[PDB]
């Protein structure tokens, strides 16, 4: 095969870097493969990438997710038979300058939920049912009501849409329903950053890689609930999701993105080539300077290829 073409379907948050290592995978795959390549890349909330495979049937080579957790849940064994863990990441609150209030917020970030909290404020996040981005951010929230002791998922989840708790478990109805339209949803968190930018969205929750991409202002949260310290599972592990879309429950959790190349992967050969380059020092590199480091080293599980199993652990 001299032309091929590799079907992506991931991740909104790993499009920018994504899109440089497919750009070098292609100088890559002509020199050393001999193979002209173009790829046929779908980005999207990460739940909605793993249905269109397991619940849409799509065709596809590849899958990326922020939530590596989706792959064994719901495309094993019938869709893939193996997956890798590679990235991680830390929720955050971004906005511009322009951003109502946002010398304040900068100012006094441990107090963000009351600025959020403002009726003159609008914020928005992902939709929990199609991106992994949108269900931590409501489990964020949740996580924040039980570190600082005040109401805030009352406050700003459950008096502004119809997602619920009960105890630590939350819910997110298959039709979502903004309450106040101060709070703005979008399929997938890169959907905000636009809105954010442009100055009539004030704050979002998202990645901190995403904002340091987007050149965006944004402040850190406590590492209790910002989802990326390893060392807090147990405590994360109290809350979890139910989405609507899928049916599951999914356990709050440090984030870790996972990757797989599906059973009946088209060009099956070619993807794996792809992702022994991807998690390779050239990927590894270009995820670097988009300040989202690969884990030392990636950790692999089921039958994995041994064409990565030099880059990996497996397990």
């Given at each position: 095969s001299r032309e091929a073409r590799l079907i992506i379907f991931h991740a909104g948050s790993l499009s920018i870097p994504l899109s440089q290592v497919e750009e070098k995978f292609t100088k890559y795959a002509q020199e050393k493969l001999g193979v002209k390549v173009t790829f046929q890349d779908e980005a999207s909330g990460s739940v909605k990438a793993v249905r269109k495979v397991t619940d849409l049937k799509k065709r596809a080579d590849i899958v990326a997710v922020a939530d590596y957790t989706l792959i064994p849940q719901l495309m094993i064994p019938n869709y893939t038979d193996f997956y890798v863990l590679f990235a991680t990441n830390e929720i955050v609150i971004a906005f511009t300058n322009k951003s109502?209030?946002?010398?304040?917020?900068?100012?006094?970030?441990?107090?963000?939920?009351?600025?959020?909290?403002?009726?003159?404020?609008?914020?928005?996040?992902?939709?929990?049912?199609?991106?992994?981005?949108?269900?931590?951010?409501?489990?964020?929230?949740?996580?924040?009501?039980?570190?600082?002791?005040?109401?805030?998922?009352?406050?700003?989840?459950?008096?502004?849409?119809?997602?619920?708790?009960?105890?630590t478990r939350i819910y997110a109805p298959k039709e979502i329903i903004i309450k106040d339209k101060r709070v703005i949803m979008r399929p997938k968190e890169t959907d905000l950053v636009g809105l954010v930018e442009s100055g009539s969205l004030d704050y979002i929750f998202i990645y901190k890689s995403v904002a340091k991409?987007?050149?965006l202002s944004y402040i850190t949260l406590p590492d209790d609930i910002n989802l990326g310290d390893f060392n807090k599972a147990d405590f994360y592990?109290?809350?979890?999701?139910?989405?609507?879309?899928?049916?599951?429950?999914?356990?709050?959790?440090?984030?870790?993105?996972?990757?797989?190349?599906?059973?009946?992967?088209?060009?099956?050969?070619?993807?794996i080539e792809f992702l022994r380059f991807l998690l390779?020092?050239?990927?590894?590199?270009?995820?670097?300077?988009?300040?989202?480091?690969?884990?030392?080293?990636?950790?692999?599980?089921?039958?994995?290829?041994?064409?990565?199993?030099?880059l990996v652990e497996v397990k």
């Open positions: 109502k209030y946002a010398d304040e917020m900068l100012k006094n970030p441990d107090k963000w939920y009351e600025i959020l909290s403002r009726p003159d404020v609008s914020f928005g996040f992902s939709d929990p049912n199609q991106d992994p981005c949108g269900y931590r951010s409501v489990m964020v929230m949740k996580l924040a009501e039980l570190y600082y002791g005040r109401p805030i998922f009352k406050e700003l989840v459950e008096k502004t849409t119809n997602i619920y708790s009960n105890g991409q987007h050149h592990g109290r809350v979890s999701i139910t989405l609507g879309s899928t049916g599951k429950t999914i356990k709050a959790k440090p984030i870790v993105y996972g990757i797989t190349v599906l059973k009946n992967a088209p060009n099956r050969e070619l993807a390779g020092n050239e990927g590894r590199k270009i995820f670097e300077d988009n300040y989202q480091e690969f884990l030392s080293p990636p950790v692999a599980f089921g039958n994995v290829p041994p064409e990565i199993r030099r």
